[PDB]
Design a protein around this ligand. Sequence first.
Ligand SMILES: [Mg+2]
Ligand SMILES: [Mg+2]
Ligand SMILES: [Mg+2]
Ligand SMILES: [Mg+2]
Ligand SMILES: [Mg+2]
Ligand SMILES: [Mg+2]
Ligand SMILES: [Mg+2]
Ligand SMILES: [Mg+2]
Ligand SMILES: [Mg+2]
Ligand SMILES: [Mg+2]
Ligand SMILES: [Mg+2]
Ligand SMILES: [Mg+2]
Ligand SMILES: [Mg+2]
Ligand SMILES: [Mg+2]
Ligand SMILES: [Mg+2]
Ligand SMILES: [Mg+2]
Ligand SMILES: [Mg+2]
Ligand SMILES: [Mg+2]
Ligand SMILES: [Mg+2]
Ligand SMILES: [Mg+2]
Ligand SMILES: [Mg+2]
Ligand SMILES: [Mg+2]
Ligand SMILES: [Mg+2]
Ligand SMILES: [Mg+2]
Lengths: 167, 78, 300, 158
Amino acid sequence: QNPMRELRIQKLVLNISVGESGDRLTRAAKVLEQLSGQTPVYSKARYTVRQFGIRRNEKIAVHVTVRGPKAEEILERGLKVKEYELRRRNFSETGNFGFGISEHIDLGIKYDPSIGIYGMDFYCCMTRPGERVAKRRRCKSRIGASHRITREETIRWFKQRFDGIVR
Amino acid sequence: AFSKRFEAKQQLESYISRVEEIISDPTLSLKLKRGQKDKIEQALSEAMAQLEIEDSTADELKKKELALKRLVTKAMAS
Amino acid sequence: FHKLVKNSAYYSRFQTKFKRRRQGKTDYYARKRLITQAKNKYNAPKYRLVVRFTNRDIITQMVTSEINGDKIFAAAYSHELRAYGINHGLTNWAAAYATGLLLARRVLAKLGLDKTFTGVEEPNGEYTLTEAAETEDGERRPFKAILDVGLARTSTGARVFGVMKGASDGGIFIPHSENRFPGYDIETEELDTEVLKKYIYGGHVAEYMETLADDDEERYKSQFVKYIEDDVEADSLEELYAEAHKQIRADPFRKYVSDAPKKSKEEWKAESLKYKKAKLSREERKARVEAKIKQLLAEQ
Amino acid sequence: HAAGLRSGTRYAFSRGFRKHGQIPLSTYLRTYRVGDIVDIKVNGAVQKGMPHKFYHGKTGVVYNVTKSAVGVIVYKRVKHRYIEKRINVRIEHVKPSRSREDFLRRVKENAELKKKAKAEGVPVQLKRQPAMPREAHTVSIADNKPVTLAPVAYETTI
RNA sequence: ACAUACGACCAUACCUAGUGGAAAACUCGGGAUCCCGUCCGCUCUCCCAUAGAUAAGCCACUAAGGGCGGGGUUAGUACUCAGGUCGGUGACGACUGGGGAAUCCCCCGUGUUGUAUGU
RNA sequence: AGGUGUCCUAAGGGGGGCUCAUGGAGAACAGAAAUCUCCAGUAGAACAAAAGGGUAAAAGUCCCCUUGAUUUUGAUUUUCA
RNA sequence: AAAGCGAAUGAUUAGGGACUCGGGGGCGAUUUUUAGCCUUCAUCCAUUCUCAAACUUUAAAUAUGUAAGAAGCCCUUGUUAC
Ligand SMILES: [Mg+2]
Ligand SMILES: [Mg+2]
Ligand SMILES: [Mg+2]
Ligand SMILES: [Mg+2]
Ligand SMILES: [Mg+2]
Ligand SMILES: [Mg+2]
Ligand SMILES: [Mg+2]
Ligand SMILES: [Mg+2]
Ligand SMILES: [Mg+2]
Ligand SMILES: [Mg+2]
Ligand SMILES: [Mg+2]
Ligand SMILES: [Mg+2]
Ligand SMILES: [Mg+2]
Ligand SMILES: [Mg+2]
Ligand SMILES: [Mg+2]
Ligand SMILES: [Mg+2]
Ligand SMILES: [Mg+2]
Ligand SMILES: [Mg+2]
Ligand SMILES: [Mg+2]
Ligand SMILES: [Mg+2]
Ligand SMILES: [Mg+2]
Ligand SMILES: [Mg+2]
Ligand SMILES: [Mg+2]
Ligand SMILES: [Mg+2]
């Protein structure tokens, strides 16, 4: 039986951690806009460590989130670089997965020497239909034990959809 | 007033340099939580300011000597 | 390896919250200010107008607080709106105005002030409040009530103020301001007074049908399946609701009957007892353990 | 040595175990009239209109009613004489008292019980009396034969 | 009896795991012109009640479940108020007239109820 | 065993959304420790300062508007004649 | 006061089980990215021996506030700017 227990992509969120504030970070945020078509959001350093040379309340990273068919398309481009091979340890106990790429121009953005080269991180969230129960404001509750995703289920979905392999 | 104020200025500087050793070494910072760490450095920020200002007297400088010491000594002891 | 946070000692020290807060249905911080009254006025009740929105209904009640529970003065739903000629869009904003008007007329007749306090009697997009009505060579102050919105967000143009607007036109006095009504522009701090009138009679959904039909025929057919079957058009929407207002004032106690199966009050009790489950007795529960022991022992 | 307004109230004003949080809401729905008997019990959560630590546990009579507070009259014992005190307390701290309910119950019962006898014509003996010594009775030993006891010898437990 | 809206006492109602749910109701669900709000129609806000489904929320039942609630035991024990030209080098203890607790351990139980509408 | 002769146009007043400390499992450079995502989490965080009490759709946190930190005089509580 | 710590905070004695990649020292070629074979601390879980004027889920004895009506209880209906 499986009427309303079909997996889908809830959202895909991807970030770049430049690690230091200044004009370099602004260029990184400039890069990320055309990839998704949405304005990105900055992040602030919550620690203050001298080894990394960062203090409190200084911007050190950017990120953005996408949903729906747009997330489906962008995820496909990332797996192409990874040639559809992921390691078994890339899937968490909850049922999510992610990866990273060293070069952001490996897929085409029509490289420009002014912006530079950045490395980007990928992460996406699985879900099942009718998960609003845990996020509506009124009469919020907790989803059942049988209705939550496990590690084995999500890797089976990945192999069947993209014909990829796991190491 | 010239001598009394000048004496307290040195003692306040000595303790600020003194506490930097505790927060810098890895051995003591290993078992001390962040919530105590950021509160000490927050108190150290305004300490730096009043040395630059000239209106500070013996009373104001002496008060924050024990205030800084009282804050740090509670974290290490427990 | 770390401490198991949820050990037997964690449960013992745990203190649970109020039962109706665990379910997330009430806000006791706001509730206290709604129901309490000055001790100068000893037993004068405070009247609340509660509005709740379900998937396919609108609920309105008149409630007074008591030490052992609440007391309901008069109630009006959206099911009862079918008897006055409305069968579609039962939860649009305009349907809230109708059920808000039904309750206001329903409560005034209960305590014998229907003949006076007629209200506007012709809806218009104007900001007005009920005032004292002269009678018997004197002035009588109007009935007063306040609005309880529950957990709904009070943004501009929300339906919660539609029931508030509808009851205000009925004759009840409810203090409020106009900055949350639709058509209010925050930039110019002015109210259009015409968007509100159009938007009362279902004008906003009427403009949706004609716009959708031209751009997307198949989508327009799917969304408005039941509108097409009863061949109700955009032009007839305003006249449909305006006629409904007339019948509310003429007779607010008209009874509506649904198509669900119906039985007597006692027969329903007998029917439900068939599907009830009986708790296991102490002797039976003890006996299962021996059976569980015997087969588990024999398994290995 | 210091004497503050709340000194020594570490355990008096604290809420109990597993009783922190939301105040039960039936408190604000009660009503009071002048001449009622109320008793004071300070709630730690509410910090406004809180009486001094002396009155935590005393009983008084309402003499004034306002928007959210009542005035209570209580008698304080300074050395060698009593003094009348008038305090203002928020209703979260006061509570109706069952001190007088036994009297009010008995007067209603007495009036009705005396009425029926006067019609009937028999003395009632209505007013109460303390416990009296027991009366003579008989105890049978049929199927209840007594059992003999005796002291026990010394013995070491540990 | 069952369901929904507003409540009262505020775990006998909470937490973990497993099975079942007539009728209606509640829920998940579909859409993004208008009011309104976001990095993202996720949340909030508008429109539809057709279609799909009891998978989850919700209700009920099961477990020599953890916890909580009531009781028995521990015990007339520990402690304590009054009394003697009472014992004892002291530490401290027994007796006379009264009041009288708390763990470990053992047994049972797993929400009750008010107003309005409807199955 | 410790504390006070100060500090604040908000760290004062009203309203609204959100939930903290910490731990488990994951993601290019990235590590004990930087940023992102999900699950658990009765306060173990935070609230100018000594210590105690109090607080979870808040009294904490961020956002929006403001000056009840204003005017005229009386009654009452604590130290106490 | 007593009581409690296989109940929170603080102090404290001892074995057992589970774990290796937490630190330390070995072994089969110290081969070792061998989750091999050894093990010493540390950690986690079910038990164990003693404590608290500035600790607590519980909780006495002795003392302590109020009440025990004629200025009371009940029925009927005048005044007012609240
Ligand atoms: Mg509110
Ligand atoms: Mg206004
Ligand atoms: Mg004192
Ligand atoms: Mg207390
Ligand atoms: Mg104040
Ligand atoms: Mg059914
Ligand atoms: Mg099921
Ligand atoms: Mg017991
Ligand atoms: Mg007992
Ligand atoms: Mg004695
Ligand atoms: Mg059970
Ligand atoms: Mg001293
Ligand atoms: Mg402010
Ligand atoms: Mg505020
Ligand atoms: Mg708030
Ligand atoms: Mg505290
Ligand atoms: Mg004195
Ligand atoms: Mg003791
Ligand atoms: Mg005890
Ligand atoms: Mg302990
Ligand atoms: Mg311990
Ligand atoms: Mg050991
Ligand atoms: Mg003590
Ligand atoms: Mg007594």
